[PDB]
Each structure stands twice: as C-alpha cells, then as structure tokens.
Design an enzyme around this catalytic site. Structure first.
Site, PDB file in Angstrom:
ATOM      1  N   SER A 130      -0.796  15.712 -11.860  1.00  0.00           N
ATOM      2  CA  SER A 130      -1.046  15.373 -13.255  1.00  0.00           C
ATOM      3  C   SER A 130      -1.286  16.646 -14.064  1.00  0.00           C
ATOM      4  CB  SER A 130      -2.250  14.424 -13.350  1.00  0.00           C
ATOM      5  OG  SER A 130      -2.675  14.193 -14.633  1.00  0.00           O
ATOM      6  N   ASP A 133       0.844  -1.192   0.000  1.00  0.00           N
ATOM      7  CA  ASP A 133       0.000   0.000   0.000  1.00  0.00           C
ATOM      8  C   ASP A 133       0.875   1.236   0.000  1.00  0.00           C
ATOM      9  OD1 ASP A 133      -1.908   1.870   0.300  1.00  0.00           O
ATOM     10  OD2 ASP A 133      -2.414   1.363   2.388  1.00  0.00           O
TER      11      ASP A 133
END
EC number: 3.4.23.22
Length: 330
Positions: free
Chosen positions: A199, A35
């Site tokens: 992004s 994770d």
C-alpha cells in the site's frame, strides 16, 4: 469457463463469510470459508473425531462415487489465530458457483481445534493463496483456483465482500457492473506464498494522506485490518476514550463513539473504509467497551488487509503468469 457464488456473513459482525461448495457425486454441499491467506481445501468429514463436530455439515467420501483416497497423503495446518486441523486426503469433483474441477484434493479432517468445533457455521476452508503453501505431504497439492485456471476465460478471481450483507466470489471474469470508477492494479510478491502487496499510505478520517509504503497481504480469511503500531495508534488517537487493552487483546473504544473512516492507498488510488466497518461491537455481551476493527500487526510479523479492508473494495486476484492485485471502489 466461469463460476459465480454468493458469500454470506456467518454472523452480525461479519466475522467470516461462507460460500456453498459442491463436493462429490451426488453433490454434497458444504459451506466453506474462502481464504486468500491459505492454500488447503479442507472439510469436516465422516472421519472427524466425533467430539470435535458440533453442528457442521460433513463430507462423507464413501457416499461419493467420484471420491478416491490419495494414498499416503496427510495434511496439517496451523493458522495465525492459533487454530489448527489435520487429516488425510481424497480427490473428488468440486464445484463453486457452476465452475467444476475434477481431481481436486479435498483434505478430510481427522482433528480440528476448538475454535473450529465451536463455529457450527463453517464446514471447512477453501484456500486461495499460492499452492506453494499447501500442506499436503508427501506430494503437495494445488488449490481449486490453480486447478481451474487453465479452463477459465481469464486467470482471475474476484472478491466482493459485503458489509453486513452477502457478496460474491467470481472466477474467470471481472463483473464490470460490480464496482465504480476504474480498477487500480498493484504488484504482488509470491515469495511468502501470499497475495502480498505494498500500500502507498493511509489517512485517518478527513486528515491528510500520509505517503508511506505498507507491505501486507490481502487475506479474506482474516476478519480485521492489522497494520503497523504507528498507523494504528494514529487512528485510535482520533477516538475519545480509545485505548489498547492487554486484558482484552487489542484496541477498544467506547461503544458511544462515532468512528472515523480509514483510507488506504493503492498506487495513486484510495480505498475508504467507513468508520462503521471498524466497529466490532461489545467485547462481551452487554459491555459498553467495543472492540476495534483496526489492530496492530506487532508480533504477527506481517500486515494483514483482512475483511475490514477488503469489503470496502472490489478486489481482483489476478493469477496471470505475473500475478497482480486490483482494487476498485464500489
């Protein structure tokens, strides 16, 4: 040193991935959920409340010659999905894919929430976010990656998750055979303890690319892609009959649909998520309403590039003094 381990979907939807991990001496092999959105290595154990164990493999420290209680240390964690676990702490030898760390904090669960009990395939979590998020008190502990780092050939790990197939986690090297083209690296903020990046925009299907900054985290422990409501609405508007269902808890779509792809930007590069990656199947067994793999991050307080996005790429988690992320097509 290096390590290389195969990671395997737990079910036909790629809801999560498990990776075998050797703990203790002799080795006890547990299948952990790696994770990159958390920083605790915790396991089902001989200490876990018996009614909360249903099919998991447990770690038994008393059977490990190298286990030592980390006296006084406790831990307690709550995840984004509302799940939780807590317990005490041992140090022991932990190996992943041939890479060994001695003295790793192995957090032994005394209690786990219902979602953990109900998932027999996950024996615990191995956190790969920054060690500033580790929950051990009163002495915070390091992740497996942070403890391994100085020994690695390069201070990196990579995630190469499969679509309905096994993939790979590598530590200490970048497998140049595992991706196509070049790797585009992008800056990381460690301020919240995550692999947080920005992004450069998105496209829906064959549509034009929208240049827009989307801050979010690279999180292998989250199944879906959670993005701002504007972006998500623009995606599902291209699917006839798709709608946000408050009863179901997100966007649903007709199982008869063909989904468009979703592109996200990494600098000037583009990662394309095929439409099929966005199908999470019937909302309940036999339903003709299917659950979407792109959902709104509204009310979560962060955008999350979970497995839906990451499995479309070869992802480099660069843990050099200045961390960075890299993405390549594959």
């Amino acid at each position: 040193s290096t390590g290389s381990a195969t990671t395997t979907p737990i079910d036909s939807l790629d809801d999560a991935y498990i990776t075998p991990v050797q703990i203790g001496t002799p080795a006890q092999t547990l299948n952990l959920d790696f994770d990159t959105g958390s920083s605790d290595l915790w396991v089902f154990s001989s200490e876990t409340t018996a009614s909360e164990v249903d099919g998991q493999t447990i770690y038994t420290p008393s059977k490990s010659t190298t286990a030592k209680l980390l006296s006084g240390a406790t831990w307690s964690i709550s995840y984004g999905d509302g799940s939780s676990s807590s317990g005490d702490v041992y140090t022991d030898t932990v190996s992943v894919g041939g890479l060994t760390v001695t003295g790793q904090a192995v957090e032994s669960a005394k209690k786990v929430s219902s979602s953990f009990t109900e998932d027999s395939t996950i024996d615990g979590l191995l956190g790969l976010a920054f060690s500033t998020l580790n929950t051990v008190s009163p002495t915070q502990q390091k992740t497996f990656f942070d403890n391994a780092k100085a020994s690695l050939d390069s201070p990196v790990f990579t995630a190469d998750l499969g679509y309905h197939a096994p993939g790979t986690y590598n530590f200490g090297f970048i497998d140049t055979t595992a991706y196509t083209g070049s790797i585009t690296y992008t800056a990381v903020s460690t301020k919240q303890g995550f692999w947080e990046w920005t992004s450069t925009g998105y496209a829906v299907g064959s549509g034009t690319f929208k240049s827009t900054s989307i801050d979010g985290i690279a999180d292998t422990g989250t199944t879906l892609l959670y993005l701002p409501a504007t972006v998500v609405s623009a995606y599902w508007a291209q699917v006839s009959g798709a709608k946000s269902s408050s009863s179901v808890g997100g966007y649903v779509f007709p199982c008869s649909a063909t989904l468009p792809s979703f592109t996200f930007g990494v600098g000037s590069a583009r990662i394309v998520i095929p439409g099929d990656y966005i199908d999470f199947g019937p909302i309940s067994t036999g339903s003709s309403s299917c659950f979407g793999g792109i959902q709104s991050s509204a009310g979560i307080g962060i955008n999350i590039f979970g497995d839906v996005a990451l499995k479309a790429a070869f992802v480099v988690f660069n843990g050099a003094t200045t961390p960075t992320l890299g993405f390549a097509s594959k």
